[PDB]
Amino acid sequence: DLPPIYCPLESAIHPRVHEVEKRAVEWIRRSGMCASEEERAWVIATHSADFFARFAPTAADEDRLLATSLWVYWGFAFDDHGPLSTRPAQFNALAGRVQRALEAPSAEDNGDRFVPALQDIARRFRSFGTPTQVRRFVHAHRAWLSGVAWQIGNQARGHMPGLDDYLAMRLLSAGGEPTFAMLEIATGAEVPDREMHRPAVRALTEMAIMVIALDNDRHSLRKHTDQNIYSVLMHHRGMSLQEAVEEATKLRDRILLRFLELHDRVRPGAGAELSTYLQGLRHGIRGNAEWGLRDAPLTWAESPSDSSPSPLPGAPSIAWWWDDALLG
Amino acid sequence: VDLPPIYCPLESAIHPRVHEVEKRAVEWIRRSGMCASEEERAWVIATHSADFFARFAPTAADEDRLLATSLWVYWGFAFDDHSTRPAQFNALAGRVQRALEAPSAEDNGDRFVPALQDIARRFRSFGTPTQVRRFVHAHRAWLSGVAWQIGNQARGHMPGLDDYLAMRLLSAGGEPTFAMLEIATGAEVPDREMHRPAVRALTEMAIMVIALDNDRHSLRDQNIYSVLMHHRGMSLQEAVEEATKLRDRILLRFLELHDRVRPGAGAELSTYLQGLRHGIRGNAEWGLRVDAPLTWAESPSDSSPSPLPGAPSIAWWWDDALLG
């Protein structure tokens, strides 16, 4: 099992990653996010500065890379530590309160450990980004919390989503959206509304997010009714773990090929800011996989395990990624 | 039981082609396959939602954009009104929101999806992709609210004031409603103007006043009256007078900030802001009628310029230093 990852994309890391990691650890200790020192050590152990420094490896301002890096840490923390992990009614309200604290500086925590921390991140994002960029992050942020709400709903009932619902869900629950909405904030490069919201750019962003979500599901086979591509396929298709491992890799490789074919057609015409955003998507895909396999020599697959130029069978909710009349 | 007149010194108007739009919308609702029982579809038709939204965009040059936007209002009443346990809802919001963002998404026997996807297609043939994403994000924000409200209900959590006002911001469906003014008008608001805090604040304040006017339309399950009675130990009448003072103080702040922002605003942000105003008044007026003369309070029941205490989620509406 576990054949090497197909990832023919640029790998790079911010030359100031060590300095930014140092500050992030310091922020985390004063963040009051986590109860014990033992937990904070888990949050530090995510090496989320190493991670987000692979997405924005030429960020001119160490401060913007630090601010965005902080959210990746806050992100892990929020998701791991729960009592709410099969209590969707309570989570719906937590989600609402936390999302509100992101949009309303005046909002008060109510002994919620996470809120003041998020509110510090938000204060940073307003210092750096335009109100437009902040809203892009806020909206992405709620998108993610809708994903998590969906996933927690499923856990409560013991619902194993099928392929369509599972892929739809993970675009959101895996944190891809708020992660990519921080590119602009890290780099400074304000992508205009006309370009950022082209269907073709939306598709590329989702495809980037979906490959990262599937790389993460693969990364979580290093441990049975947990919600992941493997369980989904074993349930709905009657496959063995090994057969589903091969199917997962076929699907994921097909999405990545589409991402590269659409990138190859969009990028030539892209303006400077969109081009920088699109390099982030690529640096992100590769950075995720690389960060997941941790300077030991790493093996990659030279070819994909499936190169069908058409949409995924059984996943109509993503078929539009392949429809060029609806895009560019 | 005894209820004062509403303070609402805002322009009242309704699209001149409203009757022709209702005609077409009634017909789409018959051909929508949304509610099976015809009896149900009559409940939807009797929202008179075209009449509601014709008040928000009364000079909209294209009758088809006012039709498209009006369908969504019917859809929202139909979806929200008439499986809805929190766990199943989180999945249901997930799918419906995905069907709005992804035209290739397949109904899978859900009755609301094909109809929302028809609305989406119309929105995509009129609005720029920018205008559609604003509506999309607004639509999720509402679904997040309805999820919050369904959560509290199933657990027996009466929220405090702050939480209730935050929730209702979303669950009233004011965001998706106001995110349709641009799609009705065709007046493209540039991002540097739309995402100004000042404009966010004017948009949320219009939304909150609509949500609190809607609450007053229910004294005839979570509402400001229930919330204030539970957390402050008021009678129904102690809380009706308290609810009116919060609302009237929010609408005062709305008029104040509008008067600061409006002279500088460009043609398109200006159309939007008149849309906020037409919207608040339309909602109040539509609330009563659903047609002989209405009475209005000439004066606010509480003209304090300060932020509401015990509602820090909304205090920033009043902080000018933060509305650069």
Side-chain angles (χ1 to χ4, degrees), chain A residues 88-90 92-93 96-97 100 103-108 131-132 135 139 142-143 146 149-150 153-154 157 165 168 171-172 193-194 197 199 202 206 316-320 326, chain B residues 86-88 90-91 94-95 98 101-106 129-130 133-134 137 140-141 144 147-148 151-152 155 163 166 169-170 191-192 195 200 204 312-316 322:
Chain A
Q90 289 145 76
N92 287 2
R97 281 198 297 289
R100 189 58 192 167
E103 310 198 23
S106 55
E108 265 159 31
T132 297
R135 286 298 286 174
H139 286 307
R142 184 187 325 274
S146 288
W150 190 344
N154 291 341
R157 296 146 56 198
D165 283 354
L171 271 164
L172 302 193
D193 263 21
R194 199 197 191 90
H197 295 306
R202 190 83 233 108
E206 279 184 15
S317 132
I318 58 156
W320 71 270
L326 171 48
Chain B
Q88 279 101 287
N90 287 5
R95 285 181 256 110
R98 188 68 195 156
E101 294 194 37
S104 53
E106 274 171 25
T130 294
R133 288 296 291 170
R134 292 169 182 183
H137 288 322
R140 184 183 282 108
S144 269
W148 193 344
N152 289 349
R155 296 163 60 204
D163 276 350
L169 223 35
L170 308 178
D191 60 320
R192 69 200 144 69
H195 303 301
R200 197 73 225 115
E204 293 190 359
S313 59
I314 68 167
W316 68 274
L322 199 33

Coordinates of all heavy atoms in Angstrom, one line a residue, chain A residues 88-90 92-93 96-97 100 103-108 131-132 135 139 142-143 146 149-150 153-154 157 165 168 171-172 193-194 197 199 202 206 316-320 326, chain B residues 86-88 90-91 94-95 98 101-106 129-130 133-134 137 140-141 144 147-148 151-152 155 163 166 169-170 191-192 195 200 204 312-316 322:
Chain A
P88 N -23.6 18.3 17.1 CA -23.8 19.4 16.1 C -24.6 20.6 16.5 O -24.3 21.7 16.0 CB -24.5 18.7 15.0 CG -25.2 17.5 15.6 CD -24.2 17.1 16.7
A89 N -25.5 20.4 17.5 CA -26.3 21.6 18.0 C -25.4 22.6 18.7 O -25.5 23.8 18.4 CB -27.4 21.1 18.9
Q90 N -24.5 22.1 19.6 CA -23.6 23.0 20.3 C -22.6 23.6 19.3 O -22.3 24.7 19.5 CB -22.9 22.2 21.4 CG -23.8 21.9 22.6 CD -23.5 20.6 23.3 OE1 -22.5 20.5 24.0 NE2 -24.3 19.6 23.0
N92 N -22.9 24.2 16.0 CA -23.6 25.3 15.2 C -23.5 26.6 15.9 O -23.1 27.6 15.3 CB -25.0 24.8 14.9 CG -25.1 23.7 13.9 OD1 -24.1 23.2 13.4 ND2 -26.3 23.3 13.5
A93 N -23.7 26.7 17.2 CA -23.6 27.9 18.0 C -22.1 28.3 18.2 O -21.8 29.5 18.1 CB -24.3 27.8 19.4
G96 N -21.0 29.9 15.0 CA -21.6 31.2 14.9 C -20.9 32.3 15.7 O -20.6 33.3 15.2
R97 N -20.7 32.0 17.0 CA -20.0 32.9 18.0 C -18.6 33.2 17.5 O -18.2 34.4 17.5 CB -19.9 32.3 19.4 CG -21.2 32.4 20.2 CD -21.0 32.2 21.7 NE -20.5 30.9 22.0 CZ -21.3 29.8 21.9 NH1 -22.5 29.8 21.5 NH2 -20.7 28.6 22.3
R100 N -18.4 35.3 14.3 CA -18.9 36.6 14.7 C -17.7 37.4 15.2 O -17.5 38.6 14.8 CB -20.1 36.7 15.6 CG -20.7 38.0 15.8 CD -21.2 38.7 14.5 NE -21.5 40.1 14.7 CZ -21.7 41.0 13.7 NH1 -21.6 40.6 12.4 NH2 -22.0 42.2 14.0
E103 N -15.6 38.9 12.6 CA -16.2 40.0 11.8 C -16.5 41.3 12.7 O -16.6 42.4 12.1 CB -17.5 39.6 11.2 CG -17.5 38.3 10.5 CD -18.6 38.0 9.5 OE1 -19.3 38.9 9.0 OE2 -18.7 36.8 9.2
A104 N -16.6 41.1 14.0 CA -16.9 42.2 14.9 C -15.8 42.3 16.0 O -15.7 41.5 16.8 CB -18.3 41.9 15.6
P105 N -14.9 43.3 15.8 CA -13.8 43.5 16.8 C -14.3 43.8 18.2 O -13.7 43.3 19.2 CB -13.1 44.8 16.3 CG -13.4 44.8 14.8 CD -14.8 44.3 14.7
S106 N -15.5 44.4 18.4 CA -16.2 44.7 19.7 C -16.6 43.4 20.4 O -16.7 43.5 21.7 CB -17.4 45.6 19.4 OG -18.3 45.1 18.4
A107 N -16.9 42.3 19.7 CA -17.3 41.0 20.2 C -16.4 40.6 21.4 O -15.2 40.8 21.3 CB -17.4 40.0 19.1
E108 N -17.1 39.9 22.4 CA -16.4 39.5 23.7 C -16.4 38.0 23.8 O -17.4 37.3 23.3 CB -17.2 40.0 24.9 CG -16.6 41.3 25.4 CD -17.7 42.1 26.2 OE1 -18.5 41.5 26.8 OE2 -17.6 43.4 26.2
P131 N -9.9 45.9 3.3 CA -11.2 45.4 3.7 C -11.7 44.3 2.8 O -12.4 43.3 3.2 CB -12.1 46.6 3.7 CG -11.2 47.8 3.9 CD -9.9 47.4 3.2
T132 N -11.5 44.4 1.5 CA -11.9 43.4 0.4 C -11.2 42.0 0.7 O -11.9 41.0 0.6 CB -11.5 43.8 -1.0 OG1 -12.3 45.0 -1.2 CG2 -11.8 42.8 -2.0
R135 N -12.6 40.4 3.8 CA -13.9 39.7 3.6 C -13.7 38.4 2.9 O -14.3 37.4 3.2 CB -14.9 40.7 2.9 CG -15.4 41.8 3.8 CD -16.2 41.3 5.0 NE -17.5 40.9 4.6 CZ -18.3 40.3 5.5 NH1 -18.0 40.1 6.7 NH2 -19.5 39.9 5.0
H139 N -15.2 35.0 4.6 CA -16.3 34.2 3.9 C -15.8 32.8 3.8 O -16.5 31.8 4.0 CB -16.6 34.8 2.5 CG -17.4 36.1 2.6 ND1 -18.6 36.1 3.2 CD2 -17.3 37.2 1.9 CE1 -19.1 37.3 3.1 NE2 -18.4 38.0 2.3
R142 N -16.1 31.0 7.1 CA -17.4 30.5 7.4 C -17.6 29.2 6.6 O -18.2 28.3 7.2 CB -18.5 31.5 7.1 CG -19.9 31.0 7.5 CD -21.0 31.9 7.1 NE -20.8 33.3 7.1 CZ -20.9 34.1 8.1 NH1 -21.3 33.6 9.3 NH2 -20.7 35.4 8.0
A143 N -17.2 29.2 5.4 CA -17.3 28.0 4.4 C -16.7 26.8 5.1 O -17.3 25.7 5.1 CB -16.5 28.3 3.2
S146 N -18.8 25.6 8.0 CA -19.9 24.8 7.4 C -19.5 23.4 7.1 O -20.2 22.5 7.3 CB -20.5 25.6 6.2 OG -21.2 26.7 6.7
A149 N -19.3 21.5 10.4 CA -20.7 21.3 10.9 C -21.3 20.1 10.2 O -22.0 19.4 10.9 CB -21.5 22.6 10.7
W150 N -21.1 20.0 8.9 CA -21.5 18.9 8.0 C -20.9 17.6 8.5 O -21.7 16.7 8.9 CB -21.1 19.3 6.6 CG -21.7 18.4 5.5 CD1 -22.3 17.1 5.6 CD2 -21.7 18.7 4.1 NE1 -22.7 16.7 4.4 CE2 -22.3 17.6 3.4 CE3 -21.2 19.7 3.3 CZ2 -22.5 17.5 2.1 CZ3 -21.4 19.7 1.9 CH2 -22.0 18.6 1.3
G153 N -22.2 16.6 12.0 CA -23.5 16.1 11.8 C -23.4 14.6 11.4 O -24.1 13.8 12.1
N154 N -22.6 14.3 10.4 CA -22.4 12.9 9.9 C -22.0 12.0 11.0 O -22.5 10.9 11.1 CB -21.5 12.9 8.7 CG -22.1 13.5 7.4 OD1 -23.3 13.7 7.3 ND2 -21.2 13.8 6.5
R157 N -24.8 10.9 13.6 CA -25.8 9.9 13.1 C -25.1 8.6 12.7 O -25.9 7.6 12.3 CB -26.5 10.5 11.9 CG -27.3 11.7 12.2 CD -27.3 12.6 11.0 NE -27.8 11.9 9.8 CZ -27.5 12.3 8.6 NH1 -26.8 13.4 8.3 NH2 -28.0 11.6 7.6
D165 N -21.1 13.7 -1.8 CA -21.3 14.5 -0.6 C -19.9 14.6 0.1 O -19.6 15.6 0.6 CB -22.4 13.8 0.3 CG -23.8 14.1 -0.1 OD1 -24.0 14.9 -1.1 OD2 -24.7 13.5 0.5
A168 N -17.7 17.1 -1.7 CA -18.3 18.4 -1.5 C -18.0 18.9 -0.1 O -17.6 20.0 0.1 CB -19.8 18.3 -1.7
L171 N -14.1 19.8 0.5 CA -13.6 21.2 0.0 C -13.6 22.1 1.1 O -12.8 23.0 1.2 CB -14.6 21.6 -1.1 CG -14.2 21.2 -2.5 CD1 -15.4 21.3 -3.5 CD2 -13.0 21.9 -3.0
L172 N -14.6 22.0 2.1 CA -14.8 22.9 3.1 C -14.1 22.5 4.4 O -13.3 23.2 4.9 CB -16.4 23.0 3.3 CG -17.2 23.5 2.1 CD1 -18.6 23.8 2.5 CD2 -16.5 24.6 1.3
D193 N -11.4 41.9 -8.2 CA -12.7 41.2 -8.2 C -12.8 40.5 -9.6 O -13.1 39.3 -9.7 CB -13.8 42.0 -7.7 CG -14.2 41.9 -6.2 OD1 -13.4 41.4 -5.4 OD2 -15.4 42.3 -5.8
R194 N -12.6 41.2 -10.7 CA -12.9 40.7 -12.0 C -12.1 39.3 -12.3 O -12.7 38.5 -12.9 CB -12.5 41.7 -13.1 CG -13.2 41.5 -14.5 CD -12.5 42.3 -15.6 NE -13.2 42.3 -16.9 CZ -14.1 43.2 -17.2 NH1 -14.5 44.2 -16.4 NH2 -14.7 43.1 -18.4
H197 N -12.7 36.1 -9.3 CA -14.0 35.5 -9.2 C -14.4 34.9 -10.6 O -15.5 34.4 -10.7 CB -15.0 36.5 -8.7 CG -14.9 36.9 -7.3 ND1 -14.8 36.0 -6.3 CD2 -14.8 38.2 -6.8 CE1 -14.7 36.7 -5.1 NE2 -14.7 38.0 -5.4
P199 N -15.0 32.0 -12.9 CA -15.2 30.6 -12.7 C -14.0 29.7 -12.8 O -13.8 28.9 -11.9 CB -16.2 30.3 -13.8 CG -17.1 31.6 -13.9 CD -16.0 32.6 -13.8
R202 N -11.9 30.1 -9.6 CA -12.7 29.4 -8.6 C -12.4 27.9 -8.7 O -12.1 27.3 -7.6 CB -14.2 29.7 -8.9 CG -15.1 29.2 -7.8 CD -15.2 30.2 -6.6 NE -14.9 29.5 -5.4 CZ -13.8 29.5 -4.7 NH1 -12.9 30.4 -5.1 NH2 -13.7 28.7 -3.7
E206 N -10.6 25.4 -6.0 CA -11.3 24.2 -5.5 C -10.4 23.0 -5.7 O -10.3 22.1 -4.8 CB -12.7 24.1 -6.0 CG -13.7 25.0 -5.3 CD -15.1 24.9 -5.6 OE1 -15.5 23.9 -6.3 OE2 -15.9 25.8 -5.3
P316 N -20.9 14.2 -9.5 CA -21.5 15.3 -10.3 C -21.2 16.7 -9.7 O -21.2 17.7 -10.4 CB -23.0 15.0 -10.3 CG -23.2 14.0 -9.1 CD -21.9 13.2 -9.1
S317 N -21.1 16.8 -8.4 CA -20.9 18.2 -7.7 C -19.6 18.8 -8.1 O -19.5 20.1 -8.0 CB -21.1 18.1 -6.2 OG -20.1 18.8 -5.5
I318 N -18.7 18.1 -8.7 CA -17.4 18.7 -9.2 C -17.3 18.6 -10.8 O -16.3 19.1 -11.3 CB -16.2 18.0 -8.6 CG1 -16.2 16.5 -8.8 CG2 -16.0 18.3 -7.1 CD1 -14.8 15.9 -8.7
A319 N -18.2 18.0 -11.5 CA -18.1 17.8 -13.0 C -17.8 19.1 -13.7 O -17.2 19.1 -14.7 CB -19.4 17.2 -13.5
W320 N -18.4 20.3 -13.1 CA -18.2 21.6 -13.7 C -16.8 22.0 -13.8 O -16.5 22.9 -14.7 CB -19.1 22.6 -13.0 CG -18.6 23.0 -11.6 CD1 -19.0 22.4 -10.5 CD2 -17.8 24.1 -11.3 NE1 -18.4 23.0 -9.4 CE2 -17.7 24.1 -9.9 CE3 -17.2 25.1 -12.0 CZ2 -16.9 25.0 -9.2 CZ3 -16.4 26.1 -11.3 CH2 -16.3 26.0 -9.9
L326 N -18.2 26.9 -19.3 CA -18.7 27.5 -18.0 C -17.6 28.3 -17.4 O -17.8 29.2 -16.6 CB -19.2 26.4 -17.2 CG -19.6 26.8 -15.7 CD1 -20.4 28.0 -15.7 CD2 -20.2 25.6 -15.0
Chain B
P86 N -30.7 19.1 13.9 CA -29.4 19.7 13.6 C -28.4 18.9 12.8 O -27.8 19.5 11.9 CB -28.8 19.9 15.0 CG -30.0 19.9 16.0 CD -31.1 19.1 15.3
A87 N -28.2 17.7 13.1 CA -27.3 16.8 12.4 C -27.7 16.7 10.9 O -26.8 16.8 10.1 CB -27.2 15.5 13.0
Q88 N -28.9 16.4 10.6 CA -29.4 16.3 9.2 C -29.3 17.6 8.5 O -29.0 17.7 7.3 CB -30.8 15.7 9.1 CG -30.8 14.2 9.2 CD -31.2 13.7 10.6 OE1 -30.5 13.7 11.6 NE2 -32.5 13.2 10.7
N90 N -27.2 20.2 9.0 CA -25.8 20.6 8.6 C -25.5 19.9 7.3 O -25.0 20.6 6.4 CB -24.9 20.2 9.8 CG -25.0 21.1 11.0 OD1 -25.8 22.0 11.1 ND2 -24.1 20.9 12.0
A91 N -25.9 18.7 7.0 CA -25.7 18.0 5.7 C -26.6 18.7 4.7 O -26.1 19.0 3.5 CB -26.0 16.6 5.8
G94 N -25.2 22.1 3.6 CA -24.0 21.7 2.8 C -24.4 21.4 1.3 O -23.8 22.1 0.5
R95 N -25.4 20.6 1.1 CA -25.8 20.1 -0.3 C -26.4 21.3 -1.0 O -26.0 21.6 -2.1 CB -26.7 18.9 -0.3 CG -26.0 17.6 0.1 CD -26.9 16.4 0.0 NE -27.3 16.0 1.4 CZ -28.4 16.1 2.0 NH1 -29.5 16.7 1.3 NH2 -28.6 15.7 3.2
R98 N -24.0 23.9 -2.0 CA -23.1 23.3 -3.0 C -23.8 23.4 -4.4 O -23.2 23.7 -5.4 CB -22.7 21.9 -2.7 CG -21.6 21.4 -3.7 CD -20.2 22.0 -3.6 NE -19.5 21.7 -4.8 CZ -18.5 22.3 -5.3 NH1 -18.0 23.4 -4.8 NH2 -17.9 21.8 -6.4
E101 N -23.4 26.8 -5.9 CA -22.0 27.1 -6.3 C -21.6 26.2 -7.5 O -20.5 26.6 -8.1 CB -21.1 26.9 -5.1 CG -21.3 27.8 -4.0 CD -20.2 28.0 -2.9 OE1 -19.0 27.9 -3.2 OE2 -20.6 28.2 -1.7
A102 N -22.3 25.1 -7.8 CA -21.9 24.1 -8.7 C -23.0 23.7 -9.6 O -23.9 22.9 -9.1 CB -21.3 22.9 -7.9
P103 N -23.2 24.2 -10.8 CA -24.3 23.9 -11.6 C -24.4 22.5 -12.0 O -25.5 22.0 -12.4 CB -24.1 24.8 -12.9 CG -23.0 25.7 -12.5 CD -22.2 25.1 -11.4
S104 N -23.4 21.7 -12.0 CA -23.4 20.2 -12.3 C -23.9 19.4 -11.2 O -24.1 18.1 -11.4 CB -22.0 19.9 -12.8 OG -21.0 20.2 -11.7
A105 N -24.1 20.0 -10.0 CA -24.6 19.2 -8.8 C -26.0 18.6 -9.1 O -26.7 19.2 -9.9 CB -24.7 20.1 -7.6
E106 N -26.3 17.5 -8.6 CA -27.5 16.7 -9.0 C -28.4 16.7 -7.8 O -27.9 16.5 -6.7 CB -27.1 15.4 -9.7 CG -26.9 15.5 -11.2 CD -26.3 14.4 -12.0 OE1 -26.5 13.2 -11.5 OE2 -25.6 14.6 -13.0
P129 N -19.7 37.5 -12.3 CA -19.4 36.4 -11.4 C -19.1 36.9 -9.9 O -19.4 36.2 -9.0 CB -18.1 35.8 -12.0 CG -18.2 36.2 -13.5 CD -18.9 37.5 -13.5
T130 N -18.6 38.2 -9.8 CA -18.4 38.9 -8.6 C -19.7 39.0 -7.8 O -19.8 38.7 -6.6 CB -17.8 40.3 -8.8 OG1 -16.5 40.1 -9.3 CG2 -17.8 41.1 -7.5
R133 N -20.9 35.7 -6.4 CA -20.1 35.2 -5.3 C -20.6 36.0 -4.0 O -20.8 35.4 -3.0 CB -18.6 35.3 -5.4 CG -18.1 34.2 -6.4 CD -18.2 32.8 -5.9 NE -17.4 32.5 -4.7 CZ -17.5 31.4 -4.0 NH1 -18.4 30.5 -4.3 NH2 -16.7 31.3 -3.0
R134 N -20.9 37.3 -4.2 CA -21.4 38.0 -3.0 C -22.7 37.3 -2.5 O -22.9 37.1 -1.3 CB -21.7 39.5 -3.3 CG -20.4 40.3 -3.6 CD -20.6 41.6 -4.1 NE -19.4 42.3 -4.4 CZ -19.3 43.6 -4.9 NH1 -20.4 44.3 -5.1 NH2 -18.1 44.1 -5.1
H137 N -21.9 33.8 -0.8 CA -21.4 34.0 0.6 C -22.5 34.4 1.6 O -22.5 34.0 2.7 CB -20.3 35.0 0.5 CG -19.0 34.5 -0.1 ND1 -18.6 33.2 0.1 CD2 -18.1 35.1 -0.9 CE1 -17.4 33.0 -0.6 NE2 -17.1 34.2 -1.2
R140 N -24.7 31.4 2.3 CA -24.1 30.5 3.3 C -24.3 31.1 4.7 O -24.6 30.4 5.7 CB -22.7 30.2 3.0 CG -22.1 29.2 4.0 CD -20.6 28.8 3.9 NE -20.5 27.9 2.8 CZ -19.9 28.1 1.7 NH1 -19.4 29.3 1.5 NH2 -19.9 27.2 0.7
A141 N -24.1 32.4 4.8 CA -24.1 33.2 6.1 C -25.5 32.9 6.7 O -25.6 32.6 7.9 CB -23.8 34.6 5.8
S144 N -25.9 29.3 7.9 CA -25.1 29.2 9.2 C -26.1 29.7 10.3 O -26.1 29.1 11.4 CB -23.9 30.0 9.1 OG -22.8 29.2 8.7
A147 N -28.9 27.2 11.0 CA -28.3 26.0 11.7 C -28.1 26.4 13.2 O -28.3 25.4 14.0 CB -27.0 25.8 11.0
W148 N -27.7 27.6 13.4 CA -27.5 28.1 14.8 C -28.9 28.0 15.5 O -28.9 27.5 16.6 CB -27.0 29.5 14.8 CG -26.5 30.1 16.0 CD1 -26.6 29.6 17.3 CD2 -25.7 31.3 16.2 NE1 -26.0 30.4 18.2 CE2 -25.4 31.5 17.5 CE3 -25.2 32.2 15.2 CZ2 -24.6 32.5 18.0 CZ3 -24.4 33.3 15.7 CH2 -24.1 33.4 17.1
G151 N -30.0 24.4 16.1 CA -29.2 23.9 17.3 C -29.7 24.3 18.6 O -29.9 23.4 19.5
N152 N -30.0 25.6 18.8 CA -30.4 26.2 20.1 C -31.8 25.5 20.4 O -31.9 25.1 21.6 CB -30.5 27.7 20.0 CG -29.2 28.4 20.0 OD1 -28.2 27.7 20.2 ND2 -29.2 29.6 19.7
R155 N -31.7 21.8 21.7 CA -31.0 21.7 23.0 C -31.7 22.4 24.1 O -31.3 22.3 25.2 CB -29.6 22.4 23.0 CG -28.6 21.9 22.1 CD -27.5 23.0 21.9 NE -26.8 23.3 23.2 CZ -26.2 24.5 23.4 NH1 -26.2 25.4 22.5 NH2 -25.7 24.7 24.6
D163 N -25.9 37.1 21.5 CA -25.9 35.8 20.7 C -27.1 35.9 19.8 O -26.9 35.6 18.6 CB -25.8 34.6 21.6 CG -24.5 34.2 22.1 OD1 -23.5 34.7 21.7 OD2 -24.5 33.3 23.0
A166 N -26.7 38.4 17.1 CA -25.7 37.9 16.1 C -26.4 36.9 15.2 O -26.3 37.0 14.0 CB -24.5 37.3 16.8
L169 N -29.0 38.3 12.7 CA -28.3 38.9 11.6 C -28.3 38.0 10.4 O -28.5 38.4 9.3 CB -26.9 39.2 12.2 CG -26.3 40.6 11.9 CD1 -27.3 41.7 11.9 CD2 -25.2 40.8 12.9
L170 N -28.1 36.7 10.7 CA -27.9 35.7 9.7 C -29.2 35.0 9.4 O -29.6 34.9 8.2 CB -26.8 34.7 10.1 CG -25.5 35.2 10.5 CD1 -24.5 34.1 10.9 CD2 -24.8 36.1 9.4
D191 N -15.8 46.6 -5.3 CA -15.4 46.0 -4.0 C -14.9 47.1 -3.0 O -15.1 47.0 -1.8 CB -14.4 44.9 -4.2 CG -13.2 45.3 -5.0 OD1 -13.3 46.1 -5.9 OD2 -12.1 44.8 -4.6
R192 N -14.1 48.1 -3.5 CA -13.4 49.1 -2.6 C -14.6 49.9 -1.9 O -14.4 50.3 -0.8 CB -12.4 49.9 -3.3 CG -13.0 50.9 -4.3 CD -12.0 51.4 -5.3 NE -12.7 51.6 -6.6 CZ -13.7 52.5 -6.9 NH1 -14.0 53.4 -6.0 NH2 -14.2 52.6 -8.1
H195 N -17.1 46.8 0.4 CA -16.5 46.1 1.6 C -15.9 47.2 2.6 O -15.3 46.7 3.6 CB -15.4 45.1 1.2 CG -15.9 44.1 0.3 ND1 -17.0 43.3 0.7 CD2 -15.6 43.8 -1.0 CE1 -17.2 42.4 -0.3 NE2 -16.4 42.7 -1.3
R200 N -20.6 47.8 5.3 CA -20.9 46.6 6.1 C -21.9 46.9 7.2 O -22.9 46.3 7.3 CB -19.6 46.0 6.7 CG -19.7 44.5 7.1 CD -19.8 43.6 5.9 NE -20.9 42.7 6.1 CZ -22.0 42.6 5.4 NH1 -22.2 43.4 4.4 NH2 -22.9 41.7 5.7
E204 N -25.6 45.6 7.9 CA -26.0 44.8 9.0 C -27.1 45.6 9.8 O -28.0 44.9 10.4 CB -24.8 44.5 10.0 CG -23.8 43.5 9.3 CD -22.8 43.0 10.4 OE1 -23.0 43.5 11.5 OE2 -21.9 42.2 10.1
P312 N -22.2 43.5 22.8 CA -20.9 43.9 22.3 C -20.7 43.4 20.8 O -19.9 44.1 20.1 CB -19.9 43.3 23.3 CG -20.7 42.1 23.9 CD -22.1 42.6 24.0
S313 N -21.3 42.4 20.3 CA -21.2 41.9 18.9 C -21.5 43.0 17.9 O -20.9 42.9 16.9 CB -22.0 40.7 18.6 OG -23.4 40.9 18.8
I314 N -22.3 44.0 18.3 CA -22.8 45.0 17.3 C -22.3 46.4 17.7 O -22.5 47.4 16.9 CB -24.4 45.0 17.2 CG1 -25.0 45.5 18.6 CG2 -24.9 43.7 16.8 CD1 -26.5 45.8 18.5
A315 N -21.6 46.6 18.9 CA -21.1 47.9 19.4 C -20.3 48.6 18.3 O -20.4 49.9 18.2 CB -20.3 47.7 20.7
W316 N -19.5 47.9 17.5 CA -18.6 48.5 16.5 C -19.4 49.3 15.5 O -18.7 50.1 14.8 CB -17.8 47.4 15.8 CG -18.5 46.5 14.9 CD1 -19.2 45.3 15.3 CD2 -18.7 46.5 13.5 NE1 -19.7 44.7 14.2 CE2 -19.4 45.4 13.1 CE3 -18.3 47.4 12.5 CZ2 -19.8 45.2 11.8 CZ3 -18.6 47.2 11.2 CH2 -19.4 46.1 10.9
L322 N -13.3 53.2 13.8 CA -13.2 51.9 13.2 C -13.8 51.8 11.8 O -13.6 50.8 11.1 CB -13.8 50.8 14.1 CG -13.4 49.4 13.9 CD1 -11.9 49.3 13.4 CD2 -13.6 48.6 15.2

